[model samples]
Target: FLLPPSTACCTQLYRKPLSDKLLRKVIQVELQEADGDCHLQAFVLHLAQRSICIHPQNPSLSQWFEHQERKLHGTLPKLNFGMLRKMG
Candidate 1:
């Protein structure tokens, strides 16, 4: 119930800005290119989800939240799960 392939543009659509894609364009790459690797990516993700952590400030946003819960109660904060590295 995560960011499946079908909903690929679900996010990109709203944030089709410069450089290329979403936050990944700025923060994500900023780390890879500048000086950060793990800490940065992980930290960015922390900051990223922390933002979404409150994404439900109102039903106005994430209105689909109810549908998600009704369907599976299976979704949560999303982004590039394969951020900097992978964990087993």
Candidate 2:
């Protein structure tokens, strides 16, 4: 299941440091309309941590991850739609 938005901040901060926010602030203005996905934002912020990737324990994080993968892969990855059937 997707997490409530209230957990977004905590999720963002998990295993991250203040440096992440600081770096994201510096790059926030550089973000363009094309960089519209939540993952792009998270990627930029996570990059601030100088880490390859962050840990994710929620569906929301997966959404962001897939978005990032699409950006890097230049094509969206196919998912097992069967997994989402459980929530519906």
Candidate 3:
């Protein structure tokens, strides 16, 4: 529900699409590197999200999920100009 509603917003991209063949190879590599209880759901979620967003020709999506918004707006400290002025 949180993901981009459609990749059909534009053509895949200038870069080659992550074909089934390449996806298979990546999955094999990922599995090999994944130690311990490798969760399938999260792995696929990340894969799907990357495949869509990284497309060279894909258009931007307007909607953002809760996590997406949070990640976009990180907990960075606001600049304190007053403190800097005092030091100067």
Candidate 4:
């Protein structure tokens, strides 16, 4: 329910559609798979409540998510997935 209703939003500057092919390419170029129970991986970029979500694996439907809005808008924090995985 939280994902962008469509990739058709015009206000968005650019839409980078993630396909299984694209996901694999991005994953290979950007990440090294870890050695445990990690089944799926993702990266999300959100702007004005819209998100461009990319996942390492294919799902029946888009594995999209969103964060609840706060009072005023601000740039979201920097996300380092490698650091996250290392910590996890």
Candidate 5:
């Protein structure tokens, strides 16, 4: 089940001196058309935290992460009906 749309903010100023804040975002995609199923697969790239920070200065962190996630996930290949059901 998916949660309703909501907004949250977090600040880490408890550690004295100076502090930083970042948005940890998540994007979910549901399948459609003829009601099929596909899974998220892995790729061969060693990505670090810096990779996802394409737009660090963006006012709304959500959009930055959303675009990055889409761009990353877009590199993956799509699944089809070729893999079978019952044996002959």
Candidate 6:
């Protein structure tokens, strides 16, 4: 029942109304092909040289992800000095 009732609260955002992380998880799980735990190989921006099969053969949906939140939120952490210092 979490579905939108009447679409009054702005179902999507910005002007493009493209897509977002919500679908990423879908192709994630659908491509899961296993139990609730899935292993879909994807573009993983890592903080380490971790062995996660971190490579994206396709940049399809990822292009969808880029136009949204991460466009600005990616730089959000360094944007604020006080909070950044507190975190550090």
Write the candidate numbers in order of decreasing lDDT: 2, 4, 6, 3, 5, 1
Instruction: Report the lDDT tens digits of candidate 6 across residue range 1-88.
Output: 1212111222221233223443333221111112233333222221112111122333432453343224433332221223222222
Tens digits of per-residue lDDT for model 3 on 33-80? 122422121111123234332331122111111223344334322323
Q: Name model 4 segments beyond 4 Å from true.
A: 1-39, 55-88
Of 3 and 6, the candidate ahead on TM-score is: 6
How many clashes (backbone N, Cα, C below 3 Å) per candidate?
0, 0, 1, 0, 0, 0
Please list the residue runs of candidate 2 whose C-alpha ends up more than 4 Å from where it truly belongs after superposition: 1-49, 52-55, 73-88
Compute the lDDT for candidate 5.
0.24
Per-residue lDDT over 22-49 for candidate 5, one digit per residue giving the tens place of the 0 to 100 score: 2222232112222122122211111322
Q: Give candidate 5 misplaced runs (Cα > 4 Å).
A: 1-60, 75-88
- Per-candidate Cα lDDT values, in order, are 0.24, 0.31, 0.26, 0.31, 0.24, 0.27
Candidate 2 per-residue lDDT, tens place, 9-60, comes to: 2223344422322433221111111235343233222332232223333343
Best by TM-score: 4
Model 1 steric clash total = 0
Q: Spell out the clash pairs found in candidate 1.
A: none
Stretch of 10 with least lDDT, candidate 3:
25-34
Candidate 1 differs from the real structure by a C-alpha RMSD in angstroms, to one decimal, of 14.2
Q: Evaluate candidate 5 by giving its C-alpha RMSD to the native, one decimal.
A: 16.7
- Expressed as tens digits, the lDDT of each residue in 5-26 for candidate 1 is 2212122111211221222312
Q: Between candidates 2 and 4, which one is better according to TM-score?
A: 4
Using TM-score as the yardstick, the better of models 3 and 4 is 4
Supply the global lDDT for candidate 2. 0.31
